[PDB]
C-alpha cells in the first residue's frame, strides 16, 4: 500500500497466468503491479548506496599564510637564499630591490631578495573514487493485503526488503502467506562510474566527472597523504606582488567555494549516511517472476456482518479511490464484498478493483481494513457488503 | 639626498635666475631639482591619504543558516503560514508536497508547505565613500646640503615636510639657512572620485567604480545600519531546492570572496593606517617658486686641510657618482674643493656637479660629508682638494 498517496505512481498490468513482468523502478517513483489471480504488490526503489569509497584527492579552496620571512643581498653579492626554501610547507619568490648606501650596501643598484611564507589550508574538499562493484540498491515491497492505513506492527508479511548488488542482481523476497516474489534486475544499466568521482565539500556532496576533477586549478594533496598534508600547486592560491622596487608581498586568494559551487550547478547531488554515500538519483530495470506469488485469502468465506466507513473515501491523484471500513462481526477471516455499480438493482460490476482479494483477517470484533478501487469514468456507487446492511457511497470521477 | 639610490629618479634643470620650475611628482618616484646659484633639492610625493570616509554599503559574501522551521497544511486546507515570515532575519519559501492518509491528511493531493531559515552573515565587505575635499598629499623635501649618508639627527634644516589639500594646494616650506621654497600644486589633476568607492574586504582594500559596486549581486545592508544588520537581497546567497515532492531544503552559496577578488584583478589597490586610507598610486603636478631659496655656504672660505675617502665612490643607476669624505681640519665651516678633470695638469673642469656648493660645516676635527657628481662620458678623474694633499680617483662611465 506504500504507493497510495504518491504522485509519481505508475500502474503496470501483467498477463493473467503470466510468469514474469518487466518494471522500471526510479527514485521518487512507485509502481503498483497487478495480475489476475495474483495479489497486488507495490514496489519501490528507496535507496542507492555507494560503500567503501577510496579517497582520491583533496583540494584546498580556502588557505591562510603565516611566518613571513625574507633574505636580502647587496648588488653584486649574488642571489639571496632562505632556509625556508627547503621546507615544502613554504612558498617562496625572488625579485630585485633598490639598494644603496642608505640601506647598508656599499654599492648602488638591484639587490636580490627572496620572500617565503608558510602555507596552511583552512578549508578543503575531498574527492573519493567509486567502484561499480560496491553500489547496492534497496527495494521495498508492500502487498495490497487489505491492511488498513496506519498499519502499526507488533516479520511483517505485508512488507519485504530486498537488496541487489552488481554481483548479486537477483533476489527472492518471502511474503509469508502470499508466497514469494523473485526479482532479476539489471544493475549494469545506468550511469557509468568509470569516470565519476564522489566530491565532498563543506558537508555537501556531488557526483562529478573524473577529468573535470583532475583539471581544477587548486592546490591538492594525494589521497594516501594522511596527517599533515603536503600541498601541490600552492601557487594556485598564493601570489606575489611587487611595489615600487621596494617590497614584495604575498597574498592568498579568497575562498573559491562559490566558484566550485557555480561550476557544480549542472551536476548530480548526493548525501552521506555515515561512511556510506547515498544517491537520490538513478533508475533500475527489473523483471519480477511471480510464479510463487499467491493470494492468501482466496479460500476465505464471505463476511456476513455489516461494515461501517471509518473515514470518507478519498480520491488519489490518479483517480483511484481509497476505502477504509470497520467490521463488527466475528466470523473473520473472511472476504469483504466490495464492488462498484451504476444500477443498485442489477449490481452488475462496473470498473475494477486495484487491491485483489480484499479481506478482513481478525476474528475479533470491530476490526478495520482498507482497499482501493478503480472506478469507471462518470458516476458510480461504491457498494460494500451484501443484502440489507450493505453500505453505498456515490462517487463521480471527472 | 633622499633621491640617491632610487631607480625611478628624474632630473629637472631650472633656469639660471629663474623664478619657478614645473615638476611632476609620482608615487615611487623622486625628483632632484637643480638651478644655478641655487641649492640642489630632492622632492618626493610620499603618501596620499583619504580621511573621514563615510560608510556607504556592506555586502555579505559569506553567510550561514540556522533555526530551520516549517509549516504544513493538508490539501484544500489553504496555504501554510509560519510566524517567522514576519521576521526580516528569516528567508522563506512556499511549495507543494504530497499528502494523504499516510501522513495525517483526510484527503490525497498537494498540501501547502512553507519553510524558513534564519540568515546570518559570517563575512562581509564594506564600501566607503570618498569626498574629493578630504584627500591630503604629503611631500618630503631633502636638500643636497653636503650632509653625509647616515645623517642621524639630534628641526632638521636639510629636511622639510609639506602637506597640500584641495582646499589649500599651496604651501611654503622653511629650510633654515637655505631660505624657503614655495609649492603651488594642482590637486584637481588626477582620477575623479565622483564615481569611486573605497572597498574593504578581509583586511584588503581597493578603489572601485560606484556603478559596479551598486550592481554586485550580493546581500547588502545600508551604511547607516549599525549593530545587528538588516540584509537586503538575501536570496543572492540562499536558494531553495525541492526533492521528489517530499521535501524542500535551503542551501547557502559558498563564499564569493574568490569571485570578487577575481572581479577586482583590474582595480587599484590601497591600504589603511588606522581610520585613514593610504593610496600607493597617483601623481601630482606642481610649480615650485624658488625666489626665496638660497645657498647656505656660498660665503664660506675654502677648506685648506686634507680629505680622506671613507667609502669607495659608487655609481648610481643613472651614471652619477657618490663621494663620502672625512676632513681632519678645524677651519670648518668651509667649501670642499671638488671637481672632475681628464688632465691633472690643467685641472680644466669637465662634467658638472649635482650637489651645488659642497661644504664641510663642523668646526670639530674628523668630520664627514657627502657630495654627488655628474661625470662626462668616458674616463675622468675625481679630484678633491687643492695642492699637494689633493686626492684623486679615476672613474669611467660607459
Amino acid at each position: 500500500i506504500r504507493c497510495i498517496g504518491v504522485s509519481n505512481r505508475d500502474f503496470v498490468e501483467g498477463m493473467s497466468g503470466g510468469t514474469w513482468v518487466d518494471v522500471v523502478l526510479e527514485h521518487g517513483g512507485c509502481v503498483t503491479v497487478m495480475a489476475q489471480d495474483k495479489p497486488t504488490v507495490d514496489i519501490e526503489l528507496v535507496t542507492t548506496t555507494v560503500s567503501n569509497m577510496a579517497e582520491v584527492r583533496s583540494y584546498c579552496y580556502e588557505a591562510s599564510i603565516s611566518d613571513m620571512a625574507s633574505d636580502s643581498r647587496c648588488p653584486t653579492q649574488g642571489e639571496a637564499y632562505l632556509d625556508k626554501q627547503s621546507d615544502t610547507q613554504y612558498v617562496c619568490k625572488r625579485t630585485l630591490v633598490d639598494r644603496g648606501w642608505g640601506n647598508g650596501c656599499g654599492l648602488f643598484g638591484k639587490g636580490s631578495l627572496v620572500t617565503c611564507a608558510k602555507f596552511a589550508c583552512s578549508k578543503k574538499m575531498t574527492g573519493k573514487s567509486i567502484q561499480p562493484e560496491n553500489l547496492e540498491y534497496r527495494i521495498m515491497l508492500s502487498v495490497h493485503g487489505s491492511q488498513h492505513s496506519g498499519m502499526i506492527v507488533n516479520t511483517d508479511e505485508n512488507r519485504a526488503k530486498v537488496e541487489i548488488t552488481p554481483n548479486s542482481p537477483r533476489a527472492e523476497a518471502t511474503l509469508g502467506g502470499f508466497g514469494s516474489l523473485g526479482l532479476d534486475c539489471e544493475p549494469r544499466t545506468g550511469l557509468d562510474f568509470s569516470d565519476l568521482y564522489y566530491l565532498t565539500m563543506n558537508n555537501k556532496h556531488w557526483l562529478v566527472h573524473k577529468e573535470w576533477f583532475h583539471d581544477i586549478p587548486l592546490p591538492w594533496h594525494a589521497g594516501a597523504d594522511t596527517g599533515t598534508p603536503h600541498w601541490n600547486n600552492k601557487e594556485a592560491l598564493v601570489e606575489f606582488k611587487d611595489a615600487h622596487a621596494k617590497r614584495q608581498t604575498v597574498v592568498v586568494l579568497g575562498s573559491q567555494e562559490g566558484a566550485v559551487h557555480t561550476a557544480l550547478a549542472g551536476a548530480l547531488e548526493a548525501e552521506m549516511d555515515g561512511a556510506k554515500g547515498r544517491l537520490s538519483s538513478g533508475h533500475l530495470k527489473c523483471r519480477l517472476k511471480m510464479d510463487k506469488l499467491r493470494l492468501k485469502g482466496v479460500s476465505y468465506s464471505l463476511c456476513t456482518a455489516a461494515f461501517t466507513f471509518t473515514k470518507i473515501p478519498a480520491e488519489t491523484l490518479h483517480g483511484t479511490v481509497t476505502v477504509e471500513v470497520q467490521y463488527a462481526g466475528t466470523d473473520g477471516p473472511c472476504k469483504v464484498p466490495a464492488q462498484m455499480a451504476v444500477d443498485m438493482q442489477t449490481l452488475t460490476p462496473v470498473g475494477r478493483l486495484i487491491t485483489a482479494n480484499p479481506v478482513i483477517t481478525e476474528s475479533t470484533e470491530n476490526s478495520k481494513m482498507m482497499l482501493e478501487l478503480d472506478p469507471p469514468f462518470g458516476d458510480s456507487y461504491i457498494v460494500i457488503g451484501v443484502g440489507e446492511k450493505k453500505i453505498t457511497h456515490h462517487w463521480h470521477r471527472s | 639626498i633622499r633621491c640617491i639610490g632610487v631607480s625611478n629618479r628624474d632630473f629637472v634643470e631650472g633656469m639660471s635666475g629663474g623664478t619657478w620650475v614645473d615638476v611632476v611628482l609620482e608615487h615611487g618616484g623622486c625628483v632632484t631639482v637643480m638651478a644655478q646659484d641655487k641649492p640642489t633639492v630632492d622632492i618626493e610625493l610620499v603618501t596620499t591619504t583619504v580621511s573621514n570616509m563615510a560608510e556607504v554599503r556592506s555586502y555579505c559574501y559569506e553567510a550561514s543558516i540556522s533555526d530551520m522551521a516549517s509549516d504544513s497544511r493538508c490539501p484544500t486546507q489553504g496555504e501554510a503560514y509560519l510566524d517567522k515570515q514576519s521576521d526580516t532575519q528569516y528567508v522563506c519559501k512556499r511549495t507543494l508536497v504530497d499528502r494523504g492518509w499516510g501522513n495525517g491528511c483526510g484527503l490525497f493531493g498537494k498540501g501547502s508547505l512553507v519553510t524558513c531559515a534564519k540568515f546570518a552573515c559570517s563575512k562581509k565587505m564594506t564600501g566607503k565613500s570618498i569626498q574629493p575635499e578630504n584627500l591630503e598629499y604629503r611631500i618630503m623635501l631633502s636638500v643636497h646640503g653636503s650632509q653625509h649618508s647616515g645623517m642621524i639627527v639630534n628641526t632638521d634644516e636639510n629636511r622639510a615636510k609639506v602637506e597640500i589639500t584641495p582646499n589649500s594646494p599651496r604651501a611654503e616650506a622653511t629650510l633654515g639657512g637655505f631660505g624657503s621654497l614655495g609649492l603651488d600644486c594642482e590637486p584637481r589633476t588626477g582620477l575623479d572620485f565622483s564615481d569611486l568607492y573605497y572597498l574593504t574586504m578581509n583586511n584588503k582594500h581597493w578603489l572601485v567604480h560606484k556603478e559596479w559596486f551598486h550592481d554586485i549581486p550580493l546581500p547588502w545592508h545600508a551604511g547607516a545600519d549599525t549593530g545587528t544588520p538588516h540584509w537586503n537581497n538575501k536570496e543572492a546567497l540562499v536558494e531553495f531546492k525541492d526533492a521528489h515532492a517530499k521535501r524542500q531544503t535551503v542551501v547557502v552559496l559558498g563564499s564569493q570572496e574568490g569571485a570578487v577578488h577575481t572581479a577586482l584583478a583590474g582595480a587599484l589597490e590601497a591600504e589603511m593606517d588606522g581610520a585613514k586610507g593610504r593610496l600607493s598610486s597617483g601623481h601630482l603636478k606642481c610649480r615650485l617658486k624658488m625666489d626665496k631659496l638660497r645657498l647656505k655656504g656660498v660665503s664660506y672660505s675654502l677648506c685648506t686641510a686634507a680629505f680622506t675617502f671613507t667609502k669607495i665612490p659608487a655609481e648610481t643607476l643613472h651614471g652619477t657618482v657618490t663621494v663620502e669624505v672625512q676632513y681632519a681640519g678645524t677651519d670648518g665651516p668651509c667649501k670642499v674643493p671638488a671637481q672632475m678633470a681628464v688632465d691633472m695638469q690643467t685641472l680644466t673642469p669637465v662634467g658638472r656637479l649635482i650637489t651645488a656648493n659642497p661644504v664641510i660645516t663642523e668646526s670639530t676635527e674628523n668630520s664627514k660629508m657627502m657630495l654627488e657628481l655628474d661625470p662626462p662620458f668616458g674616463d675622468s678623474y675625481i679630484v678633491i682638494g687643492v695642492g699637494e694633499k689633493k686626492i684623486t680617483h679615476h672613474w669611467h662611465r660607459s
Partner: antibody
Amino acid sequence: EVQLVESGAEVKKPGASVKVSCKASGYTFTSYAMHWVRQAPGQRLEWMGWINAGNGNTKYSQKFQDRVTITRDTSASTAYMELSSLRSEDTAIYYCARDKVDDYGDYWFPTLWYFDYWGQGTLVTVSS
Amino acid sequence: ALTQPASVSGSPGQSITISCTGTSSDVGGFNYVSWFQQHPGKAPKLMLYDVTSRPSGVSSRFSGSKSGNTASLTISGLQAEDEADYYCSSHTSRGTWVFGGGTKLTVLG
C-alpha cells in the same frame, strides 16, 4: 631630550608570563620602531624583536617566534614586550631601543644608526 | 654568534683595536656594523654606526674600519673613562640583528 623609561623589576616563576613596558618621551613615538634586546647577567646582548609603532607590524627572532608578543599603545606612546612559558634562562635585563621608520611609514630596512637611544633596562628573575 | 676577544687592555694614551668577525650574511654583507659601549649599571651607548660614522658627541678618538668579514674599532689616546664593555652589532641578511660576545676594555691603572 629623548628618554625611554621602562617598568620596574619583576620576579616570576618558570612557566609564567611577564609583560614589561617601555614608555618613550621627547620624540614622536609613531615615527619609530621599538626593538627589544635582552642581556643575561655577565652575558652578551641578544636581539629579541621589534614593533613598528606606527602600524603595529612586528618581527621576532626565530628562537622567540612563539613565546614573545610585542604590542603598542599609541595614546600612551608605550611599547610592550610579553614573554610566555618562562624558563630559568630568561633571567636577564631587558632593554628597548628605537630606530627610525621611513617617511612612508614602513619599517623594512633599519637606519644605519639603529639603536641610537636605549632604555635603562628591567631586571626580570625567573625562578621556582 | 659574532666572535670578538673577551678582553683587551692598553696603557693610557695608547691605541687599541677590537675585532668583530662575522659571516657573509651579517658583517661581510652589509655596512650595518655598529659599536656600542656599556658602562656597568647603565644602558648601552651608540659609539659607532655605519662602520665609520660617529654620532655627534663621541670623541674622534673612536674610529671604525671593516675588511672582508671582520670589522674593527680603534680607540686612540685611551682615557680611564673608556673602561667599559664594547659590543659590535650587525643587521643580517634575514632581517635580524646579531651582537658580539662583548669585550672588556681595561685601561691599565
